[PDB]
Amino acid sequence: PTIFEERHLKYISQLGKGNFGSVELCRYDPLGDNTGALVAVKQLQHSGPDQQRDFQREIQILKALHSDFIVKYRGVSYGPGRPELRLVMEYLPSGCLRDFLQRHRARLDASRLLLYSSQICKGMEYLGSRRCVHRDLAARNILVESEAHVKIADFGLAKLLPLDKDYYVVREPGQSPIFWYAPESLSDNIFSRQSDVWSFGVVLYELFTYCDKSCSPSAEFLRMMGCERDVPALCRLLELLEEGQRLPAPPACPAEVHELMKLCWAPSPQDRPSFSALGPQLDMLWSGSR
Numbered sequence: 095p096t097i098f099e100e101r102h103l104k105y106i107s108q109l110g111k112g113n114f115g116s117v118e119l120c121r122y123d124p125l126g127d128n129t130g131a132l133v134a135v136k137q138l139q140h141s142g143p144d145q146q147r148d149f150q151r152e153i154q155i156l157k158a159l160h161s162d163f164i165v166k167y168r169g170v171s172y173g174p175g176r177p178e179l180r181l182v183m184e185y186l187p188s189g190c191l192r193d194f195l196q197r198h199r200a201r202l203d204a205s206r207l208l209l210y211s212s213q214i215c216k217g218m219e220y221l222g223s224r225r226c227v228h229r230d231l232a233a234r235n236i237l238v239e240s241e242a243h244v245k246i247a248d249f250g251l252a253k254l255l256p257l258d259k260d261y262y263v264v265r266e267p268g269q270s271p272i273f274w275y276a277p278e279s280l281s282d283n284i285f286s287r288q289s290d291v292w293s294f295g296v297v298l299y300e301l302f303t304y305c306d307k308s309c310s311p312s313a314e315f316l317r318m319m320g321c322e323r324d325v326p327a328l329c330r331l332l333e334l335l336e337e338g339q340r341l342p343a344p345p346a347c348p349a350e351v352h353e354l355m356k357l358c359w360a361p362s363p364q365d366r367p368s369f370s371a372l373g374p375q376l377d378m379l380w381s382g383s384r
């Protein structure tokens with residue numbers, strides 16, 4: 095079904111919380127019988143004729159998206175006596191990539207990481223064809239369908255590109271540390287398919303570091319910009335980036351992987367590679383690891 099009756103959505107537990115709004119695990123159980131399917135339901139804690147307009151669009155977007163590497167949309171639920179709208183998506187028990195990479199830091203080898211990279215690239219190439227920008231690409235936003243299959247989640251920050259432009263100016267930031275975004279995003283609030291690419295490079299980094307805290311983007315960068323005094327991090331970060339400073343090669347990270355990484359971090363958005371050009375490059379490296 096596409097429209098879920100509010101009263102048949104049995105709350106199970108909390109899946110996650112955001113700066114605003116949240117996602118919880120429920121089970122659609124009209125009988126109470128417990129044979130209803132479990133789903134992932136996001137809802138806003140701040141309903142007003144403004145952020146709802148954003149949520150409305152978010153729902154339409156995910157609904158229009160048809161990719162194996164993008165969290166699947168199930169329906170909506172015009173909630174409890176309304177303006178209490180709720181987004182219903184599939185539920186992926188294995189959780190998000192972030193924790194997965196930590197729980198399985200062992201079993202996971204380069205080819206597998208490349209596989210996830212490849213699949214993420216794919217779901218990203220597709221989004222681009224839909225004139226859409228994710229804005230918040232990160233390992234914490236990637237979910238696991240199965241051992242060899244991941245998907246992109248959280249489209250709460252996504253933006254549809256106006257027909258006449260290849261970029262969007264959004265004052266609202268993403269939810270990850272400033273070290274995940276493109277310079278133009280940080281200095282001029284400009285996001286685009288090319289900015290998604292940059293953040294994709296950070297994801298790559300996260301994968302090959304297995305989302306370790308010691309060598310995470312923040313950790314490496316903070317211990318790299320430690321300088322000036324009392325200078326906002328944002329300002330000192332941009333400065334580092336302008337000087338050619340980029341994240342290092344994660345320990346035991348194949349050389350080639352780090353080179354693609356650096357490519358994604360081209361100061362100029364037009365110098366970064368496209369997802370369609372990245373995909374086959376990764377597929378090579380994957381088939382190169384056997």
Ligand SMILES: CN[C@@H]1C[C@H]2O[C@@](C)([C@@H]1OC)n1c3ccccc3c3c4c(c5c6c(n2c5c31)CCCC6)C(=O)NC4
Pocket residue numbers: 109110111112116117134136165183184185186187188189190192234235236237247248249250
């Ligand atoms: C660390 N990141 C959060 C982990 C957790 O809650 C979040 C907030 C975030 O995951 C994208 N989350 C969403 C946010 C916006 C739209 C959809 C989701 C979402 C979704 C799921 C999900 C899960 C968890 N989180 C999930 C989700 C962790 C435990 C495994 C399942 C899910 O299974 N499908 C949609």
